[PDB]
Amino acid sequence: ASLLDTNRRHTAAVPGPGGIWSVFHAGVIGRGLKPPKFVQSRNQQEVIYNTQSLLSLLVHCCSAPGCGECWGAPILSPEAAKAVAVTLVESVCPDAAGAELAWPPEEHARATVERDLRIGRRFREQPLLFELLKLVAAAPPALCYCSVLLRGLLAALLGHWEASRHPDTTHSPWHLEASCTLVAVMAEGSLLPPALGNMHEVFSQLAPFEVRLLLLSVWGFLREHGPLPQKFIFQSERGRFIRDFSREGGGEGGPHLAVLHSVLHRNIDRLGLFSGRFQAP
Amino acid sequence: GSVGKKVVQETGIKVRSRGFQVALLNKDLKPQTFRNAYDIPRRNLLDHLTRMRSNLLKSTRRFLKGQDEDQVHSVPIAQMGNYQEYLKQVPSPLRELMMIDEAD
């Protein structure tokens, strides 16, 4: 009844300029008004336990066979985790042109802005991606193969913090959460040392440019050392790969720890008690 | 004489049996919606009917042009702001005595 209703709307309120009525508008932009596009969200508890069922299934698939150290746990196969990592990369960023595991200069983030924004948007829309990322990070060498996704998400977050105008970081709750989860995952994946793997604890208390500087320090560290699986030494004692940063010659990230220490010192009024988390040993 | 490309592209889809062709849109078929009722979409039928009715009857001491907002105000962008050429078609006034930004 679009034309019927339109005919109803053509009833002239006034008799018209000369007894003849013309329609007010010159036309309609597009197909009229856009639909509201109402969103829907399910229960968060059922989401949590659906993720739990999926992640338990993936852990069972990835775990090695198998009292054998009753307080201990089975080792997750880095080959199964590598499979999960490569399919994650393909699902999120199939157009992997800059897919080198070595990280580029952080100026290159300005060349792949669209790719990084796509990665960031997919991480925002699908919270399951972070769960899969930490699943990958549970097996040490596997998170090396997710280097492109980590790099793209970090570039997106760095752009956000550069563009942020708030004085506090909590005004961007998702970006703060994503920065924290990202640093936590690459620390748990042993792509960062313990000192540089703890900065996410103080992110919530910082200004956007400070957290941006810390993430740039993370980028610089990954340029120096690199998430390369050859750096991981298989330890037959526990059947797990190990990244020993001390043999790397700069594993503490002292040049990259100077920025963190200065950020702590500048905000010592609030980050005094957090100094213990970034001690040298 | 052949460099002018004075020919029309084969706007057709040669229909297979398992002659007749399906036409395609062209650049030169500018919709004369006032002069042709087949160019009027169904969704725009009533308001455009009102518009052409007004264009026909209210032309008393006015102008009987084609469709406004199409034949005019869809000028090529090169001629969009040609004020030097535009001022010539207007009567002249009375005398009294980083590179570019569309004027001096």
Next chain:
Amino acid sequence: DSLYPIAVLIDELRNEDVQLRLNSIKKLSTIALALGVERTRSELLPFLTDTIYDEDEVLLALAEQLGTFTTLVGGPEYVHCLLPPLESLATVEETVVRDKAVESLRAISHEHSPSDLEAHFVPLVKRLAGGDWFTSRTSACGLFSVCYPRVSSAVKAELRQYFRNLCSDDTPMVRRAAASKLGEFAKVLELDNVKSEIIPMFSNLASDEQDSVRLLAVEACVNIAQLLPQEDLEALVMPTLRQAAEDKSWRVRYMVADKFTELQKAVGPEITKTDLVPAFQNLMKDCEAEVRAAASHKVKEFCENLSADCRENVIMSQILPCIKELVSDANQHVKSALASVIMGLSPILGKDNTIEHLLPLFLAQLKDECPEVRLNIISNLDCVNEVIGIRQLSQSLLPAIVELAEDAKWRVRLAIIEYMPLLAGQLGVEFFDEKLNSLCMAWLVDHVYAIREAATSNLKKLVEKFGKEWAHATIIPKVLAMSGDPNYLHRMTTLFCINVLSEVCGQDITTKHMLPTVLRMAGDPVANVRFNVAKSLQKIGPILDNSTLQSEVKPILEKLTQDQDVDVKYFAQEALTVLS
């Protein structure tokens, strides 16, 4: 030592940033006050005079500063010490600096006393007029009018001689400046001295080779004619005006045309009747469009000022055929200039003359292609209305103006709206409803907001004239229909219409017809309509009955004051306060 303010601390501020130099010059009062007045005269002013700078803005600021330097130099007694530096500024190539320097010189002229004027200022004027460079010579022209009234007679005769020499100089721009300043200079002279010295040189100026000097001569012609006694103008000014009006250059004839009314006022009516009306005639019949337009705008002012005994004879015998030919002029600017004044002839000519002769000319101009013509014609409709009544208006001009209520340009429609109350007040309900009521309603849905606003304000006057029963029968239903419109512009238009209609429709109509429509718009999706509803409820609050305020108006305002849009909140709470 680097602490002397005079040389040091000033010549060090010659940096690239000009604004610092202007700031130094702007605060030249403080350095001068720091220095002793005798020290200032001895060291500061010679430094300013001797040094020459090359930035126009600094020089302009310096010249502006020296006009108020009399207090900081030693009072009016020593004010002559300001003359050398301003003289140096009066000789520069830039004209604006020269004009500012001349302004400062004539401002400090008042500070001088007669003896000092003769001792220092008049030699300065002689030096400027006698300078090698023509710039000083033009600068000297503006200095005569302030030194002349307060000097001895011999010095006055000398000043007359140097002004005459300056006028007769071989250099063109010197003659231009002299002709420009001739009007001001001749204001203060003795009348016999004006005749003896100014008038022959003025006539010489009008006959010069250059055309700009002749233009300035005709500019000064008005003042010169105004100064003289009326018994002398036939032999002194009138031949010069005759020469000028027939000049080859159209600029001279043009600026004669703009000055024609003042000439008419100055020379007295009989001289105008005898000698000006052929000059006006061939100015209107002139070949050039600029002079024709200039003469056209002066037709009303010229004709109104003649002697009533011989006025209409002049108008119909000389002016009117020329007007008839100007109405069909090729140039639209001439027609527009004629249109803005042509209706002013209606009371002068009378009713029958207006009907027989002026009314076809109005009708021709009302149907012109040029919008300026149509706009200028309508603006003076009250005059012709008062002259010919409204029976002739309805017979002749009403179909033409009704056609102009749908004009392409909205200012024409605005004029028609502005002239509807007059017609309404002079016409009955029946005729207005037959012809013009629909026109009043057609404008409420106009694209231009100014048209809708004018029509809304016009509804108030229409209801004031034709009563509120007529409004309830003809006005209100077509206004209420606009409330249901999908365009929010029309809903806001009904809110504005209700704003102006509540005042005149009375308590009952506002309460029962308009208020329920106003209240139902509080649920509108457009915030603009919502806060305009709040504004309307504020505005129609006084003229509503007091019983429906707390019951009906107050709940809606309470709902609006917690709305999501901040503007709706603000206007709702303002309404809540005003309701008290």
Next chain:
Amino acid sequence: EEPPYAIKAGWKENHATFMNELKNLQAEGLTTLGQSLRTAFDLLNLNRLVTGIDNYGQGRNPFFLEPAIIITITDGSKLTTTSGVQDELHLPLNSPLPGSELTKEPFRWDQRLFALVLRLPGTMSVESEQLTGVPLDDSAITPMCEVTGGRSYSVCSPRMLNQCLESLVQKVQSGVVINFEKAGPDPSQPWHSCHKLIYVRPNVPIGHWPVPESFWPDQNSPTLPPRTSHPVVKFSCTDCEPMVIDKLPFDKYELEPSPLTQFILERKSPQTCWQVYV
């Protein structure tokens, strides 16, 4: 595109038409480089026989020149046709122009082909903006470019693009390409064979003596022997004397820089000359 639509701006098409046609180009066809090059040369040689600029059978006049350069901008992608991919550049011979047989090549004396091969990657190249010379491209257009007396440009950066465009602007000269060859023993080297250009300076170029034909004319030959587009000019590195008489009309043509010019200016014998033969 195909020959009816290949020519967008040819002869007697004004600059505004050229700009409008350039702005609206669309890349929607096959890499018919050979066919399009053939059509371009045919367009250049369209009016040669009407105006007799070639001077067939009457000597080769360096002052009878209509200097043109073809700047072909392309990529290194392989040449394609409807049937398949062509691994090599071959100009078609079908539909010969009237009189095309008189010169055994499509290009002419006063025509040079320059290729701007765009190898710009989709990623921001990590190479620095080195001020070195532009490389010669290795595509199928480079042999044809070199044969004509031009050269190919390989571009993979906007800086390189600017450099090639500047060099190309410097290479817009009025002249004819001469195939200089070495005759006799030394007095397999770059200066032994070169397709260099000799400059012709107008003021309407003025000249008297033609370059000799590659055959002896006769009045009984039904047909004229075909011409090489670049005359094979042979020089003897003997350092003879440059004899000149006072009033003779002699045409002087300045050679462009080349390894042969480098050799001659390096031996440093300005008072002697190498005799030149056809």
Next chain:
Amino acid sequence: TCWFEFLLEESLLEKHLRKPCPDPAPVQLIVQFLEQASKPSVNEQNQVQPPPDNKRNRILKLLALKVAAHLKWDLDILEKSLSVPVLNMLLNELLCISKVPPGTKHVDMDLATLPPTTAMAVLLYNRWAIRTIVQSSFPVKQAKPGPPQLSVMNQMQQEKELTENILKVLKEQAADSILVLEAALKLNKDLYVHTMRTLDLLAMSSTAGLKVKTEEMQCQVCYDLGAAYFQQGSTNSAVYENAREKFFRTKELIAEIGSLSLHCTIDEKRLAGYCQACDVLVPSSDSTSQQLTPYSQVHIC
């Protein structure tokens, strides 16, 4: 109001400083005075030569020092308002008028032997150097680099390279400044700073200056020394022991003074954060008896 008016009227400075709303601000007056004296002397050949030691430069510097003395030599305001080269040259000139020859090392001469005003001037210079090093260590939200506008490019680039030169000079003498500050904590005598009157007397032991508590000076010096050690503590954790001592001495001096803060303005929240950081990094034997938050309990365990 402009700068030269203070040169023409010598007593205008006092009148302007007693205004409730001095326009321009006193720090802006200091900036103007020192910038005027910083212009290199240019001969008629348009050649850059160092600024001359004329009466104009001397009176400009003296006016800047007087304005600084008006603010009780509050290093915080001079730091957040004046740039590093400006404040550097201001303090160097303050040393010069207070009879400290250029080139002499501040760690050589004893501070107690010198007059109180000269000792306090050397002390303020070393305090400023320490605080400058500490602040330069911090990160700052850099202004966005726009396209080059040469007129301002030249000025802030020469400012930045001057700042870098001053910073490396201070870093070279950082140990000397730390030793100077440490020596000053031993003093038990009343100290006097440079006022209007003392600078005026110096234009052409001693107690002509404004009396300053020994507790307040000790508190400020201990605070700055603790900040400097904390800056150094990241590279060498053993240095944090010194910083803990300095900050607890600062806390004790704050407790002693109570609420009579005049020249000693120290942020209590920042000091509390410093104390917490030192407690966590250098756990004392008595810190275990003090109430430990679950955070610190987990860290210790």
Next chain:
Amino acid sequence: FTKELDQWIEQLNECKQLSESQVKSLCEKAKEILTKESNVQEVRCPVTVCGDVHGQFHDLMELFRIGGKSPDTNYLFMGDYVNRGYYSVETVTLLVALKVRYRERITILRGNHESRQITQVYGFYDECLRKYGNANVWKYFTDLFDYLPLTALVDGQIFCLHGGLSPSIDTLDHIRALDRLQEVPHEGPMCDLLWSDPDDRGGWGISPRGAGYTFGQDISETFNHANGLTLVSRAHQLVMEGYNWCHDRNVVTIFSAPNYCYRCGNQAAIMELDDTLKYSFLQFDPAPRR
């Protein structure tokens, strides 16, 4: 605070400038309001879209007489409020005052002339000096120009913007990701949004200006399809009739400065969008000046 703002708006409507302290406080409030706005502002459907004003104050008054008074009419201004006009100060001050007073009724975007270099060259700096004697008002306004949103988005369909599109920008998320707090650069994603123009060409092209790109119909088609837009509303180019449709109604240019440099004699139009996105262009001629 609101009463004083209303007084300033009433004063500014009569073409009387504010004092320096008033401009300082106004720009402070405007900065604190424009911090919260995104690079792609979201505008509700009933709005009037205006192109360049360029300091022609009396033409802006004509615009208000045509389209209506703020706040009664929602207005979207697409930059270029200064330069090439005699009353740049009054124009920009009134627009900023309307933004501060009526936050949700006024949307002011950034034009290419809202930059320090262009204002220095093309007379906004000179006007500020002439009308105030010091560049502090120019400093306040140019610092405020950095805060202006780059683009707007009416209904999610119409993409209002000053210049045009960029080869480096494919999505609106890229625009939202840009850091607009800076002087407009000579090259880069932000420059093209303020400097580019449409053209009757194929693909991208070098702008005749020294900045931006020039883009053909296929570019705007792909941009609209990829971003779910039906129209790209635009400014930045003189239109003789005030508005012009381009690229098969994918792009429309709007110029709201009649008789642009007081010599071009152009008309000026504004796109009035009603509640249901039914547009209508209100062409208007320059005001009668006394």
